[PDB]
Amino acid sequence: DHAIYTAMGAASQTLNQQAVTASNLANASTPGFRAQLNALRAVPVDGLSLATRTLVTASTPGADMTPGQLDYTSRPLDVALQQDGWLVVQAADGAEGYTRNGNIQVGPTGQLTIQGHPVIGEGGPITVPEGSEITIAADGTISALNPGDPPNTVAPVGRLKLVKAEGNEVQRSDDGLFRLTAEAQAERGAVLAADPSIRIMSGVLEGSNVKPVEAMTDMIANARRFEMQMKVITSVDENEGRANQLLSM
Amino acid sequence: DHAIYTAMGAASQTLNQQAVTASNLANASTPGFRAQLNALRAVPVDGLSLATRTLVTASTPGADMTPGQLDYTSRPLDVALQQDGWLVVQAADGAEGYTRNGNIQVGPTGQLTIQGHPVIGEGGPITVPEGSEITIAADGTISALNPGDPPNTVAPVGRLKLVKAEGNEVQRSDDGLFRLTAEAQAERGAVLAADPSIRIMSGVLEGSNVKPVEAMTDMIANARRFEMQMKVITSVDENEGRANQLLSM
Amino acid sequence: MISSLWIAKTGLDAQQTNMDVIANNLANVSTNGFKRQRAVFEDLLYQTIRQPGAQSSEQTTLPSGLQIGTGVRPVATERLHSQGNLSQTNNSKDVAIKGQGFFQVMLPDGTSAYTRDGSFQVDQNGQLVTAGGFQVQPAITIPANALSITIGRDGVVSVTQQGQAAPVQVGQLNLTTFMNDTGLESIGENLYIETQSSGAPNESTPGLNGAGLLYQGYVETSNVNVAEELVNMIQVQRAYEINSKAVSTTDQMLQKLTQL
Amino acid sequence: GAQSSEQTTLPSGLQIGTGVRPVATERLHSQGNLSQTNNSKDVAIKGQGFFQ
Amino acid sequence: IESQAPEKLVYEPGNPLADANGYVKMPNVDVVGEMVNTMSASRSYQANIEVLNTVKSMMLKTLTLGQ
């Protein structure tokens, strides 16, 4: 009779996986979105005799660190990072989260903000003169020009800090912002170094790295597995109803 | 045994949701129609021990005040309101209903009548000279040029009153016309002011905001929920029937 | 309704909104001064369900926790403010802008709107208007019987009269610039209104303090790249189909579940 | 019910409604274009009017 | 008691009941778990009913002890 619960787990966990891919698959055309690859973990239930039951918990071993491909927007301060490079952003609470969205914006007061909770580079928040005409250089140096001054007055006004950290040492943190896995902190410290090898492209955005082929095959497999567990549940229940008749007379 | 009632409730109320969606969904291509969004309310059954049951009562919290999308018809007196705007109309019983249908019409005797029960503006029902040749301006003024007079005689003949009100402070009134909620009446009064900042888009109509996407999953979830309720009912009755053997013998 | 259904419907909503943005951005080719819109989406919060354990590093262990997350709410519709191409209209009372700036217009209700459109005219009293009669602030009143109207590169507008060998300077047509051009709240009729995301308007003559010059007889065209819109349309249709497949797969899962 | 406004509450009542009955088939009287038939007995109209 | 799982959210920032960061609260009921609970509860109910019948026969037969 307890077999049903094992099957039940799988079904529920399968639904959980579906949810993952859904939030994975709806986020196509999200700038810089990193897909959330999913897995199923076997959980043996070691006990007192003849361990036959194992449960089917679901999991997200992290995010897919595969760089999505680029849209040339020609916008002066759309920034695209090279592979395994991250923009640093002051998060909501105030902390260095990491992002791949280069859709930079400038507020009316001269504040450079990938979507609010702004950006961090070489100091605190990056602030630029109000008459922006901003350009972002190849290695991040931010140069500015007042729109009504001669072009030979474009001295740099800031620097855009970039960070190398990939995969096993990066963890999503309930926002679009990643952080360090608390295991890569008895390591390279809480606030990371600037890694003077991460390059930038201006005028290019990076899109979601959601491969639709693996998503589609994932959904197919999920549907089939769900309905297989459904058969197991039906058979077990019908067995139980069949067998409660030992006790009569 | 009383569980069946709760399940019945759900099933019954789900049908009501279906009904709403159907009326919500047949009314695509109805001019200026406001989709009647719907929700399900949990209803606990506070009692003398073990508060375990809750009902599933169906409800319509209000209408979707999301501006439907505009159709350009170039007809001189087809009106489209800006967001959160309403045309005021003398209802059947006589009271200022509010509509988004700008399909204005003129009778032979010069009564401006959004589908009859005429329109109200700056006084009683708006009246125009019989040879109307109406034009409607951006802020609501209505000018009339008799067909056989020099065109520099387009002196304004009226003004179309418009009102700002949306969502929480407006409810449907068993006709296509909306009114204030009687919670927004110890507030901006029984008859609202003209709000001389609501603009008119002339020659353009507004269609219904019936979102087919959310309606299609409304219906999918409704069907699934219904047949889950049927499974619960089946198990409950089979339980009771097989139980009834206790009392005999 | 289970979470997969609602997440996939957020995805379908997002693709529908993106298609609305594309369709508007497409239909407004041959709209003067129109600035292309780009839909920017953002993911919603992730609900951690089971925090990741300890990575003992004794073996290569998968870092499995479980956070699902949801939704694709549209976060912005950025107006891509760039200098569009010029087209000659041969109309004397017409003008385009060389660089940033907006003509200030007095709305019917009293406030000020701002337009990047030079389809100007004159009403019966000589006042400049904007294709719909909205007065261009500050008012410029052209004399009754001018031989010709000239609007210079810095807005100094003059008229030539019968007999005098001098273009009497009849008005000044000054521009308005914002510290954040993107933040202007579009209202229709080719009009933007200033909001907290754009800052106060800064008034100035063209060519000074960052305002762009003026080119008479030309109209700025929409900076819509139709090839981009077509490629985005293909992407939107495919993503819509994929999300519909997600909904359908979940629905047949549910059918089988409720069978028994 | 009443919006007690102590807490943000859904304004839930219930009305179902029905139907999309056709209420009109309007006729849009805008001037159409003209075609030359070279036919002397043919005639077109400039503006509002009808032949009795 | 109540199942204190974190009450899965949805986004409808025009709906009342949505806080800052408009996020309706949307009960966290897992339908598969609840259907399995209903099935298992019905089966256990049947087993106990049918234990009761067996025991009732047992006792009514005990009353005929001897005579």
UniProtKB/Swiss-Prot annotation, chains A, B:
NCBIfam families named among the record's database cross-references: FlgEFG_subfam, PRK12640.1
Family: Belongs to the flagella basal body rod proteins family.
Protein name: Flagellar basal-body rod protein FlgF
Superkingdom field: Bacteria
PANTHER family (alphabetical): FLAGELLAR BASAL-BODY ROD PROTEIN FLGF (PTHR30435:SF18), FLAGELLAR PROTEIN (PTHR30435)
Keywords, sorted A to Z: Bacterial flagellum
GO CC, alphabetical: bacterial-type flagellum; bacterial-type flagellum basal body
Originating gene: flgF
Quaternary structure annotation from Swiss-Prot or TrEMBL: The basal body constitutes a major portion of the flagellar organelle and consists of five rings (E,L,P,S, and M) mounted on a central rod. The rod consists of about 26 subunits of FlgG in the distal portion, and FlgB, FlgC and FlgF are thought to build up the proximal portion of the rod with about 6 subunits each.
GO biological process, one term: bacterial-type flagellum-dependent swarming motility
Compartment(s) where it occurs, according to its Swiss-Prot or TrEMBL record: Bacterial flagellum basal body
Keyword NAD attached: no
Swiss-Prot record, chain C:
Cross-referenced PROSITE patterns: FLAGELLA_BB_ROD
Cell compartment(s), UniProt: Bacterial flagellum basal body
Gene Ontology terms: biological process: bacterial-type flagellum-dependent swarming motility
Gene Ontology cellular component terms for the protein in this record: bacterial-type flagellum; bacterial-type flagellum basal body, distal rod
Pfam families cross-referenced by the UniProt entry: Flg_bb_rod, Flg_bbr_C, LlgE_F_G_D1
NCBIfam families according to UniProt: FlgEFG_subfam, flgG_G_neg
Subunit structure: The basal body constitutes a major portion of the flagellar organelle and consists of four rings (L,P,S, and M) mounted on a central rod. The rod consists of about 26 subunits of FlgG in the distal portion, and FlgB, FlgC and FlgF are thought to build up the proximal portion of the rod with about 6 subunits each.
Name assigned to this protein: Flagellar basal-body rod protein FlgG
The species this protein was found in: Salmonella typhimurium (strain LT2 / SGSC1412 / ATCC 700720)
UniProtKB/Swiss-Prot annotation, chain E:
Location(s) in or outside the cell: Bacterial flagellum basal body
Keyword Transmembrane helix recorded: no
Principal location class: other
Any GO CC annotation of this UniProt entry: bacterial-type flagellum
Keyword tags: Bacterial flagellum
GO biological process: bacterial-type flagellum-dependent swarming motility
Family as reported in the entry's similarity comment: Belongs to the flagella basal body rod proteins family.
Assembly and oligomerization: The basal body constitutes a major portion of the flagellar organelle and consists of four rings (L,P,S, and M) mounted on a central rod. The rod consists of about 26 subunits of FlgG in the distal portion, and FlgB, FlgC and FlgF are thought to build up the proximal portion of the rod with about 6 subunits each.
Name recorded for this polypeptide: Flagellar basal-body rod protein FlgC
